[PDB]
């Protein structure tokens, strides 16, 4: 039963077949963890949030950017930005000409992707595009715009914690 661990995936909040972190209470679908897992591991397993720290990112930046992106994903305010807006939604894609969501950001952390990030700067730029699109499309007083603004405050906090030696323009 593993009641020392949560009952819903930290990322998508659904039940099902869940892998338990051995250092925190979070649980994950294999495919919801960052980086995704293809099978259940043997022995002890520690999620990316609990871990301590040449194409693609360097292995240093890879671990930091994975922690940054998973931190966003596990925050429940991020749920409206996990997936692309429904192509049936009214006017969205007439207003937002460069859409961005967390599933795209997660895909581009993989060096096999043809648009893969090569620097943390490119990761931060795509996260900020997500916040920019949220503020442009949604009216400022709406629940989604407020979640966006609050999640951005969380994200700026994590940037200073994970990348104290870096400051990212605008």
């Amino acid at each position: 039963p593993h009641m020392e661990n949560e009952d819903f995936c930290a990322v998508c909040l659904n039940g099902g077949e869940l892998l338990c972190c051995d250092r925190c209470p979070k649980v994950f679908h294999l495919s919801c963890h960052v980086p995704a897992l293809t099978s259940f591991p043997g022995g002890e397993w520690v999620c990316t949030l609990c871990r301590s720290l040449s194409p693609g990112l360097s292995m240093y930046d890879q671990k930091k950017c994975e922690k940054l992106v998973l931190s966003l994903c596990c925050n429940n305010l991020s749920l409206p930005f996990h997936e692309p807006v429904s192509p049936l939604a009214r006017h969205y894609y007439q207003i937002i000409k460069r859409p961005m969501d967390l599933s795209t950001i997660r895909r581009k952390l993989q060096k096999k992707d043809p648009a893969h990030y090569t620097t943390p700067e490119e990761v931060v730029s795509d996260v900020r595009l997500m916040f920019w699109n949220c503020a442009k499309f949604n009216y400022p007083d709406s629940e989604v715009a407020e979640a966006g603004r609050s999640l951005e405050n969380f994200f700026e906090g994590w940037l200073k914690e994970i990348y104290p030696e870096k400051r990212f323009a605008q």
Partner: peptide
């Protein structure tokens, strides 16, 4: 590793 099996939402 430890695995938990709960019901999905529906």
């Amino acid at each position: 590793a430890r695995t938990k099996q709960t019901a999905r939402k529906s």
